[PDB]
Amino acid sequence: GAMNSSNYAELFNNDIKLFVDDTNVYRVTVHKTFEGNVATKAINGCIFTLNPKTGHLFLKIIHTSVWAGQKRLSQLAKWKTAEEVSALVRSLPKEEQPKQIIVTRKAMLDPLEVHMLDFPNIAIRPTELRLPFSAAMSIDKLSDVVMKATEPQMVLFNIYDDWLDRISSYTAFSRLTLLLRALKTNEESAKMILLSDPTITIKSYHLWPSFTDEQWITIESQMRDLILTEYGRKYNV
Amino acid sequence: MNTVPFTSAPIEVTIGIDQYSFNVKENQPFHGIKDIPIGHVHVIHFQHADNSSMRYGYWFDCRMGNFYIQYDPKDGLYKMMEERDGAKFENIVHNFKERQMMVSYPKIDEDDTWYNLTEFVQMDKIRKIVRKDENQFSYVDSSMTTVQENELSDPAHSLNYTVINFKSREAIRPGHEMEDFLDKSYYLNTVMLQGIFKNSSNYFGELQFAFLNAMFFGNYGSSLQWHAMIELICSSATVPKHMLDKLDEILYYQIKTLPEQYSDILLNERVWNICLYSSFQKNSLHNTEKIMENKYPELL
Ligand SMILES: Cc1ccccc1CC(N)=O
Fold first, then answer.
1. Which atom from ligand 1 is nearest to the alpha carbon of A51?
2. For the domain bounded by A164-237, which CATH number is listed?
3. Which of B34, B40, B42 has the alpha carbon at shortest distance from B99?
4. Which residues in chain A are contacts of B172 at CB distance < 8 A?
5. Is any Cβ of chain A less than 8 angstroms from the Cβ of B168?
6. Which of A7, A160, B62, B213 has its CA 20 to 30 A from that of A151?
7. Does A76 contact chain B (CB < 8 Å)?
8. What CA–CA distance (Å, rounded) separates B19 from B256?
9. Strand (E) positions, A33-69?
10. Selection from A126, A79, A78, A130 nearest residue A101 by Cα
């Protein structure tokens, strides 16, 4: 069934599962042509495939060459996503394949179902959550590796850094979704908060700053405040 | 012209014969139906006055034998039977006709409706969908489930329609996932037409038989099958031109004959809107699109 606030804790049990977000697969800038018409120019994208229990992020970079000479690219992007997710699963050892794949947008269901026909015991699920995974390209290292790619490329990151050494998966996913919700609603403010302090650094192989537990509490509070303010503004409440 | 005599009519029942229907009273002197056109299959069907549930009936072809109806008070239904003795049969019928105790198959000469609804329906194909090889005729009722439905309980009583499933390995070539899902022509033309049905006539025969079972018996699995076979053609970019023209004629007469008050349950909104307005063949069903618009504009 669909994943929602009621069955949220299921993300952190010991059944392997992956979220797949396709919101950054097909990315364009819209511009005017010499004649004054509008055209698109694609830029590199990525599939965001995340194990929420472990923090594994299989970031499949989608190079602009995959669109060359193709029509209906927004439609093709969904099928390319499903092709790449199926290929990831096939590459994985049997004991490392997911039992569920949760897609963040319902339009991924049929393409993934069709590409996963060879895996009838892998459940393809939608979700009622409004997850902020689109903001993944606001994470500097992730954006940088996508834009620099010259060919199709899979890059492997822990999106939780080593937080799991001190906190649970549930808490790590909550912190991740808060940071991403913040970056999505006001990227500039969010980034100011994370890097304001020159003494707090990001390890060479990590994505986020090396906050102590107490600094994380302050950071998380600052991020919550950012999000509620923007919300008032959005609705005049 | 052939005859289906009745032994008697012990219980009050509405009897249908093809698209016609007659009310018969309990123990009314009624001994059958005469003047049935030769050359087509036919269906004779029943709805008891006391149980508007379970419509049931028999598909038959009078070229294949002499058939009659007799009520069974133990099983509680009108049963079709075959009479092997040609002379015994002629004699029974002749007597009943002489006593003018038979209704006449009420065919208007101008009317091609039944031909148009059964053009490709062949008794031998019905008998493979409805498996009961001791009889030459086939029983169908409202409740019988299809094989495909059974996959998702009694095999002997199933409708063995050809299983169509758009998200299946049979439908989707490895490496052509998107292509085959968005353009079902290889499923239609290679898998179904060339492989399973052998020709478009057998495909149309099963489509027409599914519609008629849905219409006469409210058989839900039959309706599912009818719509699936329509959607497979409409979702195919490449269809022989003779098939498209014939499909338009087939569906026109099905939509024409459908009871106006059943269009709610018998017509699937998504399939018809996708077929008439989004699919590859949105522009290939002019007659069907025109009768749907002027009769069921609500559904669309
Ligand atoms: C992607 C990744 C991240 C952290 C640890 C291990 C991996 C490799 C894998 N999951 O196959």
1. 10
2. 1.20.80.40
3. B34
4. 114, 117
5. yes
6. A160
7. yes
8. 12
9. 38-43, 45-50, 56-62
10. A126
- Nearest C-alpha neighbor of A92 from the set A162, A44, A154, A47: A154
Residue with tokens 């989608």: A62
Q: At how many degrees (to 10) do helices B241-257 and B286-295 cross?
A: 20
B154 and B121 belong to one structural domain: no
CA distance A43 to chain B (A): 23
* Contact by Cβ (8 Å): B199, B214: no
Q: In this structure, what is the dihedral angle of CA atoms B48, B50, B55, B57, given to the nearest 10 degrees?
A: -20
Q: Write the CATH number of the domain with boundaries A9-163.
A: 3.30.420.230
Could you write out the three-class secondary structure of chain B?
Answer: CEEEEECCCCCCEEEEECCEEEEECCCCCCCEEEEECCCCCEEEEEEECCCCCCCEEEEECHHHCCEEEEEECCCCEEEEEECCCHHHHHHHHHHHHHCCCCEECCCCCCCCHHHHHHCCCCHHHHHHHCCCCCCCCEEEECCCCEHHHHHCCCHHHCECCCCCCCCCCCCCCCCCHHHHHHCCHHHHHHHHHHHHHCCHHHHHHHHHHHHHHHHHHCCHHHHHHHHHHHHHHHCCCCCCHHHHHHHHHHHHHHHHHCCHHHHHHHCCHHHHHHHHHHCCCCCCCHHHHHHHHHHCCCCC
Tokens 């025109």 belong to which residue?
A: B290
User: Do the chains contact at A110 and B168, CB–CB below 8 Å?
Assistant: no
Cα–Cα distance measured from residue A34 to residue A19, given in angstroms and rounded to the nearest whole number: 42
- Residue B251 CA to residue B246 CA, distance in Å, equals 9
Residue pair A69/A60 in contact by the 8 Å Cβ criterion:
no
**Side-chain half-sphere of A12: how many Cα atoms within 13 Å?**
11
Question: Which residues in chain A are classed under CATH 3.30.420.230?
Answer: 9-163
Residue that the structure tokens 């002019």 belong to: B286
Domain of residue B76, CATH code: 2.60.34.20
Show which of B143, B161, B184 is a domain's final residue.
Answer: B143
Q: Which of A34, A48, A80, A62 is nearest to A147 (CA)?
A: A62
Distance separating alpha carbons of residues B254 and B283, to the nearest angstrom: 19
Measured in angstroms, the resolution is: 1.6
